[PDB]
Amino acid sequence: QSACTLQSETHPPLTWQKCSSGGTCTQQTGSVVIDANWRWTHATNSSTNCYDGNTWSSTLCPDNETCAKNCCLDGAAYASTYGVTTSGNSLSIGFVTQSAQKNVGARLYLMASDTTYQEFTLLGNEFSFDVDVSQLPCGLNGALYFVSMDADGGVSKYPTNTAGAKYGTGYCDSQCPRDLKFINGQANVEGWEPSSNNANTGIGGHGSCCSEMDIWEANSISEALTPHPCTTVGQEICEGDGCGGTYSDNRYGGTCDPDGCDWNPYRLGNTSFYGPGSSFTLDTTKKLTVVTQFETSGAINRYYVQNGVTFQQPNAELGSYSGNELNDDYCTAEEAEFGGSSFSDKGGLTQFKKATSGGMVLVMSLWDDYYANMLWLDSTYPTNETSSTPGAVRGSCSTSSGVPAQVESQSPNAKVTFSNIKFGPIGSTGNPSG
């Protein structure tokens, strides 16, 4: 896709800190950009939409190539249309924003410059951020994660994509998403199936895969940490059911692991650690710091800070595993006790190390789930399961919670605030900010 300028594009600024082993941190200035899927897509020479509702213009977009030649992405009014605002080192994403249209959520990337994404090499480093999940009820997910996207949004590889990172192009993840309108410089109009439950989305014939590190998928009820390997580390297009993931016939048939080796404290047995109120170790009605360390062995460590008190990830006992570190033994025990072989089949933490050793882009989002109502995160899933089934219970939300239309109308003012992002060598982010 190309870019149009009927509406200007001004990325909201966001500062973050880069720390060093020597004990000092320094302020960095970046900005955020909204994903292409949320943008107005119209003809290069007029205001005629190439996509409206959940259908493509058959005249402007008869096929993927023609569509990309005829159509451009335009600028975004961040606050008024998308409910995205920034203030210093703070970023807020509103749930439902009503302007001339209704907008639900947003997926944003941290930029290095106006035309390129900031890449972070995670291995041997740690990432820290503060978060306020108090306004996120059952059914919502304020996520902060990393994906192996190209810095230019794919421009150097796909010439027909001239919009680039500036317009939020090039997204990919371990779900190998097929809801993307533009992938590899072409539209995704071929094979498009409008969603039966979502008036604004659909599934195309192609998807975009890559490694994904979900540092934080959470609401005020539950939270999960989840690495997802892929046999091809970086962004790669997939076709139809060969994509795997949620909207394909064989979920485990693709190149990526859509499940991951997840760590949810509640799912592992500690139902008193994270939740709303004083009866929980970490009280989700108040702000908290989340620190994630990527050691060179490939293992992942985690500690939290609230009101100056530090809490290491709580201990879990799962089969032959005992500890609080997300490592090979944990991932193997998880598969043995809860089932599955996807994570291991994709290479486990060894293959995932190839992703963290390379550059990854920071993504911050707020979404509701039209497929499984976020039950996999904060409720019993599948819903026919009991608490007696290992790993079935992931949170205290009702299995009737999370219906998108219901939460959109009941909690439109829900929001997540991510702030004070710090990144540096292990043991460095707790030092004084610059």
Ligand X SMILES: OC[C@H]1O[C@@H](O)[C@H](O)[C@@H](O)[C@@H]1O
- Catalytic center residues: 212, 217
HEC secondary structure over 181-226: CEECCEECCCCCEECCCCCCCEECCEEEECCEEEEEEECCCCEEEE
Nearer to ligand X, 17 or 174 (CB): 174
**359 is in the binding site of which of ligand SCc1ccccc1I, ligand NAG, ligand X, none (Cβ under 5 to 8 A by kind)?**
none
Q: Does 382 sit behind a cis peptide bond, omega within 30 degrees of 0 on the bond before it?
A: yes
Q: HSE-up of 169 (CA within 13 Å, CB side)?
A: 33
**338 is in the binding site of which of ligand NAG, Ca ion, ligand SCc1ccccc1I, none (Cβ under 5 to 8 A by kind)?**
none
Ranked by CB distance to ligand NAG, the top (closest) residue is 314
Q: Report in angstroms how near the CB of residue 391 gets to Ca ion at its nearest.
A: 24
Q: Report in angstroms how near the CB of residue 112 gets to ligand NAG at its nearest.
A: 37
Total residues interacting with ligand SCc1ccccc1I, rule: CB under 6 A: 4
Q: Report in angstroms how near the CB of residue 51 gets to ligand X at its nearest.
A: 23
Window of 16-24, 229-237, 257-265, 325-333 that interacts with ligand X by CB under 6 A:
257-265
CA distances from 9 to 106, 112, 113 (A): 16, 16, 13
Report how far residue 22's alpha carbon sits from residue 431's, in angstroms, rounded to the nearest whole number: 10
Binding site for ligand NAG (CB under 6 A): 270, 272-273, 281, 311, 314
- DSSP string of 242-306? GG-STTSSSTTSSSB-SS---B-TTTTT-TTSEESSTTSSEETTS-EEEEEEE-TTS-EEEEEEE
Nearer to ligand X, 30 or 245 (CB): 245
Binding site for Ca ion (CB under 5 A): 299
Q: Which residues contact 229 (CB under 8 A, 6 or more apart)?
A: 174, 211, 256, 257, 343, 346, 347, 348, 349, 351, 352, 355
Residue window 243-262: x/- pattern of binding to ligand SCc1ccccc1I, with contact defined by CB under 6 A? ---------------xx---
Q: Is 376 in the site for ligand SCc1ccccc1I (CB under 6 A)?
A: yes
**281 is in the binding site of which of ligand SCc1ccccc1I, ligand X, ligand NAG, none (Cβ under 5 to 8 A by kind)?**
ligand NAG
Q: Is 305 in the site for ligand SCc1ccccc1I (CB under 6 A)?
A: no
Q: Is 372 in the site for ligand SCc1ccccc1I (CB under 6 A)?
A: yes
Out of 92, 175, 411, 428, point to the residue binding ligand X (CB under 6 A): 175
DSSP-assigned beta bridge partners for residue 182: 187
Report how far residue 35's alpha carbon sits from residue 37's, in angstroms, rounded to the nearest whole number: 6
Cβ neighbours of 88 (radius 10 Å):
11
Report how far residue 160's alpha carbon sits from residue 20's, in angstroms, rounded to the nearest whole number: 40
Report how far residue 33's alpha carbon sits from residue 182's, in angstroms, rounded to the nearest whole number: 16
Q: Report in angstroms how near the CB of residue 282 gets to ligand NAG at its nearest.
A: 8
Query: Which residue carries 């050691």 as its tokens?
Result: 295
Nearer to ligand X, 117 or 216 (CB): 216
Q: Report in angstroms how near the CB of residue 216 gets to ligand X at its nearest.
A: 11
Nearer to ligand NAG, 47 or 312 (CB): 312
For residue 400, how far is the Cα from the chain centroid?
A: 24
- Catalog residues that contact ligand SCc1ccccc1I under the rule CB under 6 A: 258-259, 372, 376
* Binding site residues, ligand X, CB under 6 A: 175, 214, 217, 226, 246, 259-260, 262, 376
